[model samples]
Each structure stands twice: as C-alpha cells, then as structure tokens.
Target: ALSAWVGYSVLGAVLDPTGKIVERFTPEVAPISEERVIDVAPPSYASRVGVREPLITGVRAIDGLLTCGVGQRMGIFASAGCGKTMLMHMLIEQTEADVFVIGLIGERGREVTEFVDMLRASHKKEKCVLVFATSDFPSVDRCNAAQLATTVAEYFRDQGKRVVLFIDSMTRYARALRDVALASGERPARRGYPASVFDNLPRLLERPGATSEGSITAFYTVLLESEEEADPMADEIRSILDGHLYLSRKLAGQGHYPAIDVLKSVSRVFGQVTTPTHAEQASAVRKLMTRLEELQLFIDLGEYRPGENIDNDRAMQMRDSLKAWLCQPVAQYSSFDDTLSGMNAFADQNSA
Candidate 1:
C-alpha cells in the first residue's frame, strides 16, 4: 500500500484507500516492551493471551445477572437519582478482589467523609483507595483525575493483585473535557462535547485488562444522557464494556433497592462465568421476566380481563414472587443458590 507513496513527499498522516487521514503519522516509533512487568525481562510471563476467571461481586442479583470477569469492564448506565452509586457501593461491599481504586471526578453532591465512613462500615477500607476530583476543583484537573487513578490500579495489577477500578461518574469526566475544549477553541461534536472525546474516553477506559496472570477489572458509573442528542460519548464507553447494568428510574420509584431494569441489563460473560446448568436457568428466568412485561402490557391495554384467567393464570403470583425476592440488598439473598431456588420453583408454573 505504501509503495505508491515513494514518488510523493509524504505528509504527516496515515491514510487508507480514501484521501482522509486515518490518524496522525508519528515520525519515529518507540522501542517498547510490556511482557515484563518490572525491569524488562522476557520469556517469563503468564504465557496466556485471554481473559482470566470471574471477579465475583457479592451482590447476588448482579452476580447472577451481569456476571463480570476479571480484566473485563462493566458499566452502570442510568439516569440521575437512580441507584448507580448504590450499585457501585454494593460492589465495593461485596467484590472479592485484591486492589480497590475509586475515582470520583467532578462530583458536587455526596460528602467524601461520609462515603469513607460508609466504606469502613462495610469492611472495605483496608484494601481500597478513593480519589476525588470534584466540581469544586479546576475543570482541567477533573478531566484527567480518573486516568491518574487508573495509573495506581495498574501498579497494583503489576504486583499480581486483582484490581477493580471504580469511576463514580465518567459523565463529568467527559464534561470536564468539554470545558477544556471550549476554552481551547475546539469544535464541539455530538452534543457540545469535543469531537476528540470519543477517541480520548477509550484511552482511560481501556487501560484495565487481565492477560497472563494479573487482571484489572473496571466498573464505570455513567449518568444517563438527559438531552435528545444521541450521546456520542456514552456509546463509546458502552462499546468497550463486557457487561452493562442499566438501572431504572421508574423501578426505583416503585421501591426496588438496586432498581435494575432486568430487560435492559446484560452480562456478556453470563454463559462463561457460571456453570452450564446455572446459565440455562438464568436464561429461563430472563425469558420469564420478559413474558411478565408483555402480560402487564396486555393487562394495561384491557385486552385481557382481570377476573378472567389468560394462558398463565398465575401471572400476578409469579410477578410478585420474583419482585419480592430480587429487590433486596446482597446480604439478604445470600448466594446464587438462594435466588435460583425461588426462580426455578416459581418460573414455569406461572410463565409461558
């Protein structure tokens, strides 16, 4: 492809078949190596090129629903006042891991002292480090604070520890970038955010990975986009995640603690994280829940009468059963077995 370029004085750009430059052309390539974690040494690595085992978050519903693997990324996507931080806190209270890195960039609400006390109360203070770059700080500082936290998390991974990095609000991080971009006279792209945010968000989010031995798992909490714009930065963040836990504001108002929207949430590693039998059962449960949604729609539209029974005459009983069981905190549920027991008992009997 480059043979034709010999006759032309090459510009500082890498190009495809089209005339558009794909990326900036660096004049010199650096000599770099990462097989060795410490002083550069080769032939003595973990010797694998795939993901590691599951990092079990003690939250049973999350563990059973959106199972995250070590070195994989999971995102908490929800609108404001939904349980995004609540889910994050639950993970901190429950994840069985080595290093804990919490980054709170450009936050206005939530007292830091109270949060630390809450963590201590949950027995998580010993191994975790919390970094805060709130709204009170300079916008530029919040822009890069999450990256700094990532650097620390990487250091722990190099020490052969399983690290889970938590950034409370990536939304603010992107906004901080927009703040800088406006000051620097850059053009806005999707929604008043800089065009470069798409490229930059990946650099920070992509740092957590587990290959060979050590792994760095990342859980990013991102607020749902309020505007009608397509949310360019949001898509970029979600694309890199292995699992997505989407909380529901409507469900939150209905009094579910975690307020997770079962239909909207997914764990890509669901089949891989648990045994085949459990995966099959979880899949069944999801389908049952989905059917309930359809049933409710039918009932609301008055297509079906209340006194008259439909195909699954036991719809209301089963819906109440699942809701009552699944809505509580992690401690109450105990394990996947507890959840599975009720689901199996109540699933097919009341579902199509």
Candidate 2:
C-alpha cells in the first residue's frame, strides 16, 4: 500500500490493505508509549477527587433520571435501528467534555463514513479524536483501535483535561477477542469467548476514571439482536459498568422517541453524584412511573376496579403527561437546569 508521510512517525491517514483510508489519526499531542491496561495496570481504587459531578448529557431521560457522573463508566444497550447511535450523537453534541475520544469498533463502513461527516460539520469537531476500527478491519486491528482510543483518553486525563470516551458497540470488540481466541485454539467460555476475553474486558472498561487532576467518562454501547435475546456479552458488560441505560423496543413501538426504559435502566451512583433536589425529583418521577406501570397492567387486563386501584383516572392522566414530559424531541437540547425543572413537575403528583 502506498503511504504519504505526514510527519516523522504520523501518517496523514491510516489505510487498510485496499489502500483506502479507513481512519485518519491526526496527532494533536506528542507521542506516548502505552500497552493494553489489561497487561499492565490493575483497576484503580483511587476515588474521583476532582468533583463527582454530573456530565449533563442534555437528554432528559439521562440527565433527568439516569444521571452520569464525570468519571462514570456507563453502557447503552439496544437492538439495531433503535436510538442507541442517535443518543450517542446527542451526548457528544450537547455534553461539555474538554476532549472526546470516540472508538468505532467493528461497525459498518457506511456508518463510519456518516460519523466522519457528522464530526466534520459539528461545532465540537476540534475537541474530538475519532478512532475507527470498523467491521472491515481485521480483528487484531479492531482490538488495537480500542487500545488506541483508551490510550488517548488516558493521555488527556494525565494532562489534567476532562475526557469523554464513546465506544460504539463493545459487543463487536468482544467478537474481535473471540476471533483471536479461536485462531489461537484457546478454550472458549461464555458464548464461545475465551478465558482471556473475560480478563481483557475490564482492561478497556475500567480504564475510565476521575483522578485528582482530571477524569475520563466512558460511554460504550452494546448492540442486542433483540432486547429479549440472551447474550452473555451484555451480561458481562453490565456486571463491569457503573450504570446502564436500556432502550426498549416496546417503548419505541408506543411512539416514544428516546425510548429509554425508566424501569429497567438505572444509575447506581445517582444519589452520590447528583444534587439532593435532583435526587428528590428523580425519586418522585420513579414513584409515579412505578405506580403508573402497576395500574397500566391492571388496565391492560380490563379489570374494572376503579376505586380499588390506586387512583386509576389520575394515574392515566399522569401516564399521558409523564410520557410526554419524558419524550424530548430529537432536536431539542435541555440544560441540567431544564432537566431538573422538567422532573420538578412530578413533585406534586407524587405527593398527592
């Protein structure tokens, strides 16, 4: 393959065997030598001292309910054609991270191209660093791409810069691990993945953290064939991450745009990270939604006990309004304050 020398070590662009530039790795900082954290470093027990603040993703469903901390490791789980990609796009567009490291691991070629276009036109383009190891690349290349992204994130964090890393479809990263494992004749574990697969998963996932200087908040997506499909990869990822947002096909089918399943999704650090007022509001919203879910089940079964049920008529109204409140339009951007106010609307209803 013909290569153009952009610098001493940096290539103007990275090309595959076909000589097509699958990704461009333009260096914004000086070089640093690093290996996979899995081989070198154990998970840090250091607490995030640089303010355990919320990232304020501008999505009402996330900031308002499923809050994300500055150094949080959050996962988004969804099937294809759902709003997983859309949500990630929105997060990058709206969130205020000092630097962004996006790892596109084993995605389609066209989708990668679209992402490049999106980044080029984005106002936050300068702050972004994209690492693409799309589906077209070899499994080893994909794994390296994940490592490279994490390395960049670590570099920025060490420089006292807040970083946000987005890894699209970590399931593909795991598949790449499986590929290497199969080729080496390693014994397979859950879903045909090797023992090293389990060990190496945290090397990437646990790399993001908040330190005395700065933080790296990582958001990775897990693509499910269907929400009902039982995949060990999803289970493994959930067990490692701090929190998760589940996008429901059922909610989308009912015309909810974000379609984040409030009942199924949770931020374990919600109380620890957000304001007390926000926590109180979130509690109210959860109570209202939980009650609404219970009453709706009875309504679905056509059980006509109006007085016996928990204020059936009021619950129906709350459901309509609550669903409407949660369903923010795709183009709209809500500030952290706006998100809080939106949830504040639920306070009186919960009290009643």
Candidate 3:
C-alpha cells in the first residue's frame, strides 16, 4: 500500500504503525497547526542532492554556459515570452533531484494549480512540492512564500534526499516584500523597493549548499523588468547568483528558444569544477563569441553606410559555428564536458 500522512506540504511529517504524530517538518512560516504523523523505525534514506553529481539544467546550452554546480545558486533573467515558464516545465520534467520545490512568487494561483494538477498524472508529482501564493494573496504571504519553499527544501535535505528549489521569479518576491514594507510605513529605497531584501535574499540563497551531511541546489528566475521603466531589484538579485543565464530578445525573435546570451551569461563554478581542458575551451569559445558580437555589430553598421568595409567572411563562419553549437531544443540534455570540448575546438579556429 502507498504511504499516507496528514499535514501541509510545508509541514509534513512521517508516522509509525501506531497512528500518532511523530516526525514533524516545521516550515519557516505557517499557521500554528499543520501536521499529524507517527514516528517509525529507521527513516528511509533516499539520497543526498547535487553535492557529488551536480544538477543539470537539462539544456546543454545552459549547463555548459553556467556550469551549474551541486548546491549552487543560479539565476535566470529574461523578458516575458522568452520561454521562462516553458523552461520551468522542462526542468520539473527533467531534473534528477530527489525532490523539486517550486515557488511561484506573485504568479497566478490558477496557473500554478493547473500545472500542478497536470503533473499529478505523472510520477514526478509525488516527489514534487509546490508553493503557490498568487498575486491575490496578501503581500505578507507572497513575501514569505520563498522562505516557505526553502524550509521545505531543508527538511528534505535533512532527510537525506537531494533537493532543488526553484522560484519561478524572485523579482515577484522582492516586489511583494516591497509592498508589505511600504504598507507598514517602511521607507522605500531605490526603485521604491526595500533595500533590505538585498540582504534577505542572499540569506535565503545561502541556505542551499553541499555539506558532509547533504546537498541542495537553489534556482530563482527574475523577470528582469516589470511595468516600470527600470528594475533595480532584478539587477541586485543577479549580482549574488553563482550562475547566471541571461536571455536575449534578439535571439528569441530570431528563433532561438532558450535565447541565452552567450557572451553575457556565466557560470562561476565552471572553472572550479570542470577540467582545465573544458575550462580552456569555454574561455576560448567565450572569446570568439565576444569577437563575433563586435563583428556582427560592425557588419550591421557597415550596411547602414556605403563601402564601410568589413570582413564578414569570418563572421559568417563564426555565426554558423555558434548556431550549430548553441542551438539546443527544449527537453534536450547533453554532456557538459563533451559539449565544452567541441566548443573549444571550434573556438580555437575562430578566436580571431
């Protein structure tokens, strides 16, 4: 028979044969009453998370670009319709972590519930936990939702199960915190947001790390902008991430699904975890990519004027090479090492 229990996903607990409340997983913020389960014998130890095996984005373009490490914190930045939600679905479907904790901050409750319901048809729903505090919820709840997800993740990590915490858009969390802060008469800072969140978010991000006991990976998406003309909060969040994937509208319009900014995005852990050969190849590719960016810009400008000579022959070759290398379809994953090796080999010739 399937195991059963009674408790909020945020505060779940396991029970023994004797129907009595046992191990309680207390979440960071919730109503006082939230559980019922009895203690059992030795708890089932599934496994630890990203510490030894590092979690992959299931998209070679992102994995290689960011070199996501186990217990690492990654940030995704993109404009609306640039495939953030699609990417999230793919990750939920593809990530190999023992558990997936998703926090849909400032997102619609209907959308969250719908996707969750659809997931119930699959086996992943059993291992997945969701924190769905929509825009209609009180700002206080939305502000606490991210922390709630973190608490659940820590609970699973302690139980020896590897966990991946994914926040659809952390910018929403910041905005919700700002809303709460302002309503309570707190002074607003840059872009009318509480500056203290800069401190709080890092504190939350720091919660996921690999240790002798267990490991956990943290990922948060940033809408990168709102109705406002500027988004200082998103900019601040990007600074603290160990890995960053910057989405480009140009690439997206040009039919690049992931549309990752080859030159802008970076995985700080790549060099630390990858072999010298891999790292060298990435750097070389990066260099060629950067040059290509400039060359492309020059070619574009040259077209605006007559006889503004530009050597586009190499640029065309570089473009084709990048198109071949960076083009990755959704739900597709490949080896990070092998991908980097091929990238470096191409960059070697195009490094001009």
Candidate 4:
C-alpha cells in the first residue's frame, strides 16, 4: 500500500538488496554516503538560544554591512553575469563551516561540471558535499535534488556540526516544481507557477535552523528576468527570506567584480547578530555610498563642478577610496580583521 509510494532516497546502488555495500554513488552523482525514506519527515531542532551567532564570509561588503546570522536564509539576487557565481566562490573559499553542502539545481550541464571541477581544485573539497541536477534531468529529479541537499546538511547539523548550504538558482528548482505540479493537474497561479509552490517553499527554506548545539545557514541564488518584465514569484520569494544581496548591473559596468548594490542589499538580522560599533559603521558607510550615488548623477550630466562645493569635492575623493577598498581581486580573500579595519577606516573618515 503505502510502501509502494515510499521511495528510498538512494545514494548508492543495491548490489544485494539487504547486503553489504558493493558500490556507492560517484562524487559526481552524489557526494555523500547516506540514505533515508522520503516519506519520513526530517527532525526539527529547537530555536537558537542566547546570542545570535554571525557567519563571517570574510568579504568586506558582506561581513561589514550585510552580515549573515546562523540559521538565516539569504538570497543572492542577480542578473546573468553580474558575478554571483564568483561571489559564491569567495564565500565557499573563505567561510569557516563544519560542512559545506552545495546544490546546483537545474543549472546548465557545462556550468555544473565547471563548478565541480573548480571545487575539486581547491583544498576545501574534502569538507564539501556536492549535489546537482542539470536542466536535462527530469522535472521530478530536479525538484527532489533540492530536498536531498537539505537532508544531507540536516544530518550533519544534527551531529552538532555547523553546516552551510549553498543552492545556486533556487528559481530553477521552483520552476521544476511548477512543472511537476502542472503535470499533476494543479492550478496555475502567478507567472504560470502552481499555487502550491508557495506552500512547498517555506517547508524547504525553513528547514535550516539554529539550536544550542549546532546551526545551518543557507544561501540561495535567484536569477532576475529581463528589465521590462516583472516576476511576482521572485518578489514573493524575497519577502520570505531573511535578506538578500543584489548584484547591480550598473556597478558591474564600472568594473566592480562583486558589484553588490549597497542601497538594495540588506541583512534583517544585522542588529541582533552584530555589535553596536558594527551597526554604526555600517550605517555610515551606507550613507556615504548614497551620497556618492546622488553626486555622481550631477557629475554625469556635466552640470556640476567638483571644486565648486567642498561637500561635493569631499564626496568625489571618498568615492575613489571607497571603490578601491571595496573592490578586491577575484583570487583574494580578505581576513575578518582586515575587513573590519577597512570598514572602520571608511566610517571614521565619513563621520566628519
């Protein structure tokens, strides 16, 4: 009866149904050695107690301003080629977590292969667990791949390990989910996605939690459509997450590698997870960037002279230094101390 529907989340082949393991899933197919009955609900842990711990990725823009907390679900919302993948690489290379679970769901086959190769080349590969289903896979396979990655991370977290899960393009996973739902005769909602897509999202996204013993911090990427078209699904997804890092095309055109849009990016738990000094400095930096943005508009129109106003002169000078501090080489990983020092330097100068 129910057993027919009780499919095992298989990570290895069954040489003998109930015997010793003969062969396991290749590092490409599945990176870990574990399985569970899909029907059983995953264990839910207690909420984080005491102070909200911060997960430092050692990126100045992120660690200084958009600080992330343990158990938080952060989004990287970016258009194609704005360096979302490169940002994720820096995060994976620098962040210290007990386990790193990366799920690249419904991405192109070539992208998946290249990413896997990149990870293997790094020393961090041992601590990582890669799970991916390319776009060519069946919709159901893509849909379940997200859960499989979460389940693996959950297992490590249950063992009192601090785990981080990175899912590149959760939008594709949702699209695959929509495909499965449409095929099963579900009603279509906004943007032709099934209404139940919202229901399933929370259950998966909320699975990452912090407890007294351990925590799971998750980050997922969301791709933006064309400039003229609005995506209601993307809007809803943003509302549900703790915060997001938006990579701006405007900044990228100016040769900003990370290209994080300072005005648009935010960390909802910033107050709870960081110190008062951090808060004050971050706010000041934000104000400086905002002023620079405003001043740049007039400069672009050639209607203003920098030397005519002291404030504008100061802003132009600060903008040059700020960009120099914020823009790091793609291969560089800044230390947390260095990041803090850089932020303090900018904030102190801007305080005048």
Candidate 5:
C-alpha cells in the first residue's frame, strides 16, 4: 500500500506540478463565450451637411487664370520680400471669401502679436481670424498648432462658409519639423531636413472640395530659398501648385508693374477655363508677343537697320504694335483684366 501511494504521488507531481491532495479531478472543458448586444447606429444628422459655393469676386483675369472656383488651394512661392504677403493681402481684400491668417512662430509671441496688429490696421477685422502659435511654446504644442489651425478652417467650412487659410513663410514650419526630427533621432536628409518633409507639405495643402453649401480655400505663401543662382524652391513648388507667378527685379528694372516674368510664370489651370473667346484672345496676344521678340532679336544682333528689313509702312505698324503691348499698364492686381483685353484687342487690329 505504501509503495502504491508513493508511485501515485510521484505521477501526480509530474502531471500537475502544484499538488494539492485528496483525489483532485480535471473539470470538463467548455467553448469560448461571446456577448450579444444591440448595435447602435451612427447619427444620421452627420451626413446632412451641405457644401459651400465659390464666392466670385469681380476680377475676371485672375478668375480666368485659376480654373478652380472659390475654396481651392493655391501655393504661392517666391524669394523674400517679392510681394508674396502683399499679394495675399490683395487677395484677401479683393476676394469675396472670408480670410483666416494663422501665424506660426517658432518661439516668438511678440512677432505674432505684431502681425495681428498689422492685419487689424489693414482694416480686415470682420472677415479675418488670426491664430497665433508662438515659438516659445513647446515643440509638441507648436506641432499641434498646425493641426489646430487646419481644424479651425475645416470647422468654418463645414458651416457652409467660404474660408481662406493663409500661411506666411512655411520655411519656419519646415525648420520646426526638422528640429523635431533631429530630437527624435531621425537621420537628417538634405539640408538637415528629414526625408519626410516633402510628404507633409502636400497632405497639409489638400483642402477639401466645396461641401454641398460651403467651401474652404487655402493659399500658402512660402519665402523660398534660392541655392547658388538656381531656384530649388521653385522646382519643389512646381509639383504642388496649379499656377506659378514669378516676381523678379530684372523685370522690374524694365518698367513693368508687378514685374512678373511671363516666360517663367505659368498657370496649369488656365487652360481649363480658357473659353474659345479667351483662347482666341490669348492666341492673338501670343502672336503679337512673338513678333516683338523677333524684332528685339533683330535689333540685338545688328542684323538689320531700323528701316532695312521692312518699308516705312510695315515698320511704323510694328513700332505701333510693340508700343501698345509695352505701354499697357497693370495699375492694380486686378488690372490684369484690362491688360489681357487690351492685348487681345491690339492683336486683332494687327492681324491680317
């Protein structure tokens, strides 16, 4: 009996590790159990919100250039002090959409306050909202500010209102992200920026299309850095914008108002909105411009005297047409209307 008991104890210890005593038996196994609960449906009212219609300001030329209606996203990139911010102000004052200017400073509240005061002085108090996220804030808070500003714009847009979000100087924001990446042990890529910089810009730029009743427009102005006579920022911006406007001192020196280098500037969306009326008008102007360029080349190369290549009648006609194109003034940002029309009219008169 003692030998049998010892054998059983040893077997029990091997099988059960924790041995508790007298005749312990295994219970029957059962399958897993699941709870049955009624599913609560999402709120139906959430889907009832409408989209906003684009606000049409009376400027036909700019409207023609940007095929998108109000609430579209446009990125304006230029070297520092090339009137980018001033252009933003012009858009705000001229456009029918409400403008919200969010100033993101790396750590400076005073600068943000100063910017707010400037905007207030500009007399746009009623249609504008200023969100200030200063550099003094912690890095996480600064990062959160970008998201917060975006949410604010979205909120206003959902209310069936046209909202314009203007961010001045995106370079500072880039720097903030670069700093964060370095702190997080991310390997720095080109120019000490993390490889992810390009990814963030587009995601932030995509403003949703007009809701059934309202729309949000986003305009970003970046003070771009030019690298050793080459425009690196312009290359980066080309990937993101529907249109490009270039402001150069070289053009300004030639007595051109706004000094836009038409050769360097382009509007990809302009083709979409070009009606047959506008296209014919544009084609005529392009022909006139080509003629002017040929005349300029002839003079520059000294290949022909003023009257050697053509008779007095043709020369006078060419001279008159060239003068008309050059003397057409752009007085206001909206003056582009008069310029385009004048150019088309001259083209019609000069064409055979």
Candidate 6:
C-alpha cells in the first residue's frame, strides 16, 4: 500500500502540470482528486539559529579557522606545488569522521599511490579509501570518476555514516572533458573549454542532501591558472561550492603556512551556519581587509614616500600589521568546533 501511494505521488508529480491529480472516468476528464492535492502554507518566520554546532575533529587548527562541517562542499584552489594536497591530507588525518574517500582524477597513478603510501606510513591509512581514475585513462572513463565517487559517498550516507570525499585537482578533470570535446570536433568555449565542461563540472560538485547523523562532505582541490592575475577557472568553480579556500605562492614566500589569502578567498555559506553576531564580526573583518588593500595601493604608488603628503610611518605600520595578521598560521587558531571563539580572538588581535 505504501509503495502504491509513492508510485501514485510520483506519477502525479510527473503528469500533473498544475500539480492537481487527474482521474479519468471513461474518455472525458473527471474532477481532480482532492486526495492528490496538498496545499503548502507560506513559510513562517522562525527565530534565527546559531551555526551548526561544530563537528570538531581533534585537529584544532583547521576546524578552528575554516569551520567546515559535514556535508559541506568546499573548493580549494591554488597554483601548482603550494601544499594543497598536504593540507587536504592533514584534514583527512585529523578529521573525526569515520570514513575519508579520496577521488583522484587526471593525475598520475603514482601520485595517488604516493599519497596513499604516505598516509599509511603516518598510520592514518585504515580510515581512508583512495579511488583513482588517472589522467592516462580514457577520457570517457575519466569523466565518469566523479560520479562514481559521489555514488560511494551516497552509499556511506545510506549506511548512516559521515564520509568525506576529497577530489584532488578538479581543473584537470575539466581539461580532460575539454580535450574529449575538441577531439569530437566541437567548438572551444570560454578559455578553450568545451561548453559541456561548464555544465558538467557544477553537477559533479553539488550535494543536495542536508547533513544529519548520516551525511557526506565533499572537499575538492582545484589547480587554478590565473590569466593576468585573476583566476577565471576559480571564478567558475566558486559558483559550485559552499566556500572557497585559496592558497598563493606569494603568501607562502611570506612565511604563511596554508597561505590562505583571506582577501582572495570567501565562504559564501558561512553566514548560513554562523550566528548573527559572528556574521557581523565577519563583515568587520572584510572592511578591515578592504582598508588594508587601499593602504597597499598607496605604498605601491610611492605616495607615502618619506617626506610625502601622507605620513609614511603610519602607512608602513598599518601595512605591516595587516600583513602580520594575515600570515598567522591556523595552528595558532581555535578549532572548527570553536570558530566563533577563533574569530573573536582574531578580531581582538586586529583591534590591538
């Protein structure tokens, strides 16, 4: 009887354009079945809630600073060799989640093996699974790898477990699809990517289910090529993620580990889980970041030369302070479970 009811609902949803179920008596259409109708009331205003209570892995640094949660989909973008993989490995190691599933597409098989081997050597291999469809694989097969990975996540989700799915280098996957399309004689779209790459990439990243006891979080690492200093690939990838984590070589050279350029990165859904007070704090931080940018511009133009119109001492001090604050390592920060506390700490430090 339950199956019949569900079958009826599915049929009605598909066949009834107005969502009013139709019952036919003979050839002529009869009155719509009142049993098939559901009137949805307008949503009521609910009291604002705090951020989802943090899922703290024992790792204090990442959870404290980034505040990632189960079922959240994040994009990590960086140039080559900026420790993107290393940071991801740290997350997998330290996260409290029961299962970590990594999907490697468009990379060498040996690279995937090396990563797994390193994790095993560190004694963190038992909890993680590595799925590889390397670059040398047929393009069609490579395109299907993300779907296979998602299916694995869904399987874990159904089993009432938390699973973290990490994809190393999504950009390469995009390139593989573009290559396939070009080989098929299709016109190159924006940035020489086939039009389908744009459509398919987002579909792979979107996770529709909410996180409860059983859910999966997907973390994707993307290698972004900045054409003229702006990451066009990152821009497109940004639209598909809950947040963006950006790492830059310039920050690395300046002695910042994780080198997350806050100015260049953002978490669009951060406010969804954060409290109103924390949201305000985040806004204030953004304002300070904006002012820091202006100060940098002034220094770049030499407008604050030793005897110039503006006092060089004040300008230099402000610039140095901002740079120092930006370079603070995540290890010194609070965990994801205590994101508000970490934010408060940073805010206090910035004020001083």
| Winner by lDDT | 2
lDDT of each candidate versus the true structure: 0.65, 0.76, 0.66, 0.74, 0.50, 0.59
Candidate 6's TM-score: 0.71
Which candidate number has the best TM-score?
4
TM-score of each: 0.79, 0.86, 0.79, 0.87, 0.65, 0.71
Question: Mind giving the per-residue lDDT tens digits that candidate 6 earns over 1-352?
Answer: 0001111122101111122223211121222222211111211224212225444544333343455655677888888757787777767666677666676777786786677566555444544555566667787655555545555455556557777878776887777778889888888889788787887787677642344457677888888664126667777887778787788877666666666767667655566656677667666666656766776786768555655545556556665664664444433433444655645655554563
- Judged by TM-score relative to the true structure, which candidate is superior, 4 or 6? 4
- Worst 10-residue lDDT window, candidate 5: 10-19
Predicted candidate 2 versus true structure: per-residue lDDT over 195-265, tens digit per residue = 98898888778778888778899998998889778787898889999889999988778778787998889
> Candidate 3 — which residues are off by over 4 angstroms?
1-53, 121-123, 226-230, 304-311
- The list of candidate 6 runs beyond 4 A from truth reads 1-66, 182-187, 208-211, 227-231, 300-333, 336-342, 349-352
RMSD to truth, every model = 12.5, 4.5, 8.0, 4.8, 21.1, 13.6
Clashes of 1: 0
- Model 2, position 290, has a per-residue lDDT of 92
lDDT of 1 at 87: 73
Rank order by TM-score, top first? Answer: 4, 2, 1, 3, 6, 5
lDDT of 5 at 215: 63
lDDT of each residue in 207-271, candidate 1, tens digit only: 77775767788888877854123666677778877778888888888878788787788877677
On lDDT, the stronger of 1 and 5 is 1
* Backbone atom clashes (below 3 Å) for every candidate: 0, 0, 4, 0, 12, 6
Ten contiguous residues with the weakest lDDT in model 6:
1-10
